[PDB]
Amino acid sequence: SIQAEEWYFGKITRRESERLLLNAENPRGTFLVRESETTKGAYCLSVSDFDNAKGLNVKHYKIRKLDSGGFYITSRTQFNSLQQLVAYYSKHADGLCHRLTTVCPT
Protein backbone atom coordinates (compact mmCIF):
# COMPACT_ATOMS: atom_id res chain seq x y z
CA SER A 1 0.00 0.00 0.00
CA ILE A 2 1.58 3.35 -1.04
CA GLN A 3 -0.81 5.09 1.27
CA ALA A 4 0.45 4.09 4.87
CA GLU A 5 4.01 4.68 3.59
CA GLU A 6 5.20 7.44 6.03
CA TRP A 7 6.89 9.40 3.09
CA TYR A 8 3.55 9.43 1.19
CA PHE A 9 1.82 12.81 1.86
CA GLY A 10 -0.99 12.15 -0.65
CA LYS A 11 -2.98 15.10 -1.88
CA ILE A 12 -0.93 18.04 -1.00
CA THR A 13 -0.03 20.73 -3.46
CA ARG A 14 3.40 21.72 -4.84
CA ARG A 15 3.45 24.94 -2.70
CA GLU A 16 2.62 22.94 0.45
CA SER A 17 5.45 20.42 -0.30
CA GLU A 18 7.79 23.48 -0.50
CA ARG A 19 6.46 24.99 2.71
CA LEU A 20 7.36 21.70 4.49
CA LEU A 21 10.65 21.02 2.83
CA LEU A 22 12.06 24.60 3.14
CA ASN A 23 12.83 24.21 6.91
CA ALA A 24 16.44 25.03 7.87
CA GLU A 25 16.66 21.85 9.90
CA ASN A 26 16.04 19.69 6.90
CA PRO A 27 19.39 18.20 5.47
CA ARG A 28 19.89 17.70 1.78
CA GLY A 29 17.73 14.88 0.42
CA THR A 30 14.77 15.35 2.87
CA PHE A 31 11.83 14.22 0.80
CA LEU A 32 8.16 13.16 0.44
CA VAL A 33 5.95 11.69 -2.37
CA ARG A 34 2.56 13.42 -3.14
CA GLU A 35 -0.02 13.35 -5.94
CA SER A 36 0.91 15.36 -9.10
CA GLU A 37 -1.15 18.59 -9.62
CA THR A 38 -0.69 18.41 -13.48
CA THR A 39 -0.85 14.53 -14.25
CA LYS A 40 -3.65 12.25 -13.27
CA GLY A 41 -2.30 9.06 -11.97
CA ALA A 42 1.21 10.39 -11.49
CA TYR A 43 3.05 11.39 -8.33
CA CYS A 44 5.66 13.93 -7.52
CA LEU A 45 8.84 13.18 -5.58
CA SER A 46 9.68 16.56 -3.78
CA VAL A 47 13.30 16.78 -2.50
CA SER A 48 15.20 19.38 -0.49
CA ASP A 49 18.67 20.48 -1.56
CA PHE A 50 21.13 23.15 -0.35
CA ASP A 51 24.22 24.76 -1.99
CA ASN A 52 26.14 27.93 -1.39
CA ALA A 53 24.77 29.38 -4.84
CA LYS A 54 21.08 28.55 -3.99
CA GLY A 55 20.98 27.99 -0.17
CA LEU A 56 17.98 25.75 0.68
CA ASN A 57 15.68 24.91 -2.27
CA VAL A 58 13.35 22.15 -3.50
CA LYS A 59 13.13 20.05 -6.71
CA HIS A 60 10.18 18.06 -7.89
CA TYR A 61 10.31 14.95 -10.07
CA LYS A 62 7.35 13.28 -11.68
CA ILE A 63 6.89 9.65 -11.07
CA ARG A 64 4.72 7.80 -13.68
CA LYS A 65 3.23 4.37 -13.30
CA LEU A 66 2.50 2.46 -16.56
CA ASP A 67 -0.58 0.36 -17.01
CA SER A 68 2.07 -2.25 -18.07
CA GLY A 69 3.21 -1.79 -14.44
CA GLY A 70 6.45 -0.14 -13.94
CA PHE A 71 7.02 3.00 -11.79
CA TYR A 72 9.70 5.48 -13.00
CA ILE A 73 11.11 8.99 -13.11
CA THR A 74 13.06 8.13 -16.41
CA SER A 75 11.66 5.33 -18.50
CA ARG A 76 15.25 3.98 -18.73
CA THR A 77 15.01 2.98 -14.96
CA GLN A 78 11.83 1.28 -13.83
CA PHE A 79 10.60 -0.41 -10.65
CA ASN A 80 8.01 -2.95 -9.76
CA SER A 81 6.73 -0.69 -6.98
CA LEU A 82 6.95 2.92 -5.66
CA GLN A 83 8.75 1.51 -2.68
CA GLN A 84 11.51 -0.05 -4.65
CA LEU A 85 11.78 3.31 -6.56
CA VAL A 86 12.13 5.15 -3.26
CA ALA A 87 14.50 2.45 -2.03
CA TYR A 88 16.77 2.83 -5.18
CA TYR A 89 17.00 6.69 -5.05
CA SER A 90 17.87 6.57 -1.32
CA LYS A 91 21.11 4.83 -2.64
CA HIS A 92 21.76 6.44 -5.98
CA ALA A 93 21.54 10.15 -6.64
CA ASP A 94 21.59 9.60 -10.50
CA GLY A 95 19.99 12.71 -11.97
CA LEU A 96 18.35 13.83 -8.77
CA CYS A 97 19.50 16.85 -6.79
CA HIS A 98 20.50 14.53 -3.94
CA ARG A 99 20.00 10.93 -2.93
CA LEU A 100 16.82 10.48 -0.70
CA THR A 101 17.81 10.73 3.01
CA THR A 102 15.20 11.59 5.59
CA VAL A 103 11.33 11.65 5.35
CA CYS A 104 10.06 15.22 5.56
CA PRO A 105 8.82 16.06 9.07
CA THR A 106 5.24 17.14 9.07
Summarize this entry quickly:
With 106 residues, this protein is an alpha+beta fold. It has a 6-stranded mixed beta sheet with strand order 1-2-3-4-5-6. It is found in: Cell membrane; Mitochondrion inner membrane; Nucleus; Cytoplasm, Cytoskeleton.
Written account of the structure:
This protein is of the alpha+beta class and 106 residues long. It has one domain: SH2 domain (SHC Adaptor Protein). The protein has 2 helices and 6 strands, in the order βαβββββα. The protein has helices at 14-21, 82-89, and strands at 8-10, 31-35, 43-51, 55-65, 71-72, 78-79. A 6-stranded mixed beta sheet has the order 1-2-3-4-5-6. The chain is globular and about 40 Å long. The two termini are 20 Å apart. The relative contact order is 0.23.
Brief descriptors of the model:
106 residues, alpha+beta, SHC Adaptor Protein, 6-stranded mixed β-sheet, 2 helices, 6 strands, 15% helix, globular, signaling protein, SH2 domain fragment approach, monomeric, proto-oncogene tyrosine-protein kinase SRC
The helix tally amounts to 2
Helix content: 10-25%
Tell the overall outline.
Answer: globular
- The whole-angstrom Rg is 13 Å
Proportion of residues in β-strands? 25-35%
Tally of strands = 6
What is the correct CATH architecture?
A: 2-Layer Sandwich
CATH fold-level name:
SHC Adaptor Protein
Physical arrangement of strands within the biggest beta sheet: 1-2-3-4-5-6
Order of helices and strands: EHEEEEEH
Quaternary: monomer
Protein name: Proto-oncogene tyrosine-protein kinase Src
Domain SH2: 7-104
Modified residues (Phosphotyrosine): 43
Subcellular location: Cell membrane; Mitochondrion inner membrane; Nucleus; Cytoplasm, Cytoskeleton
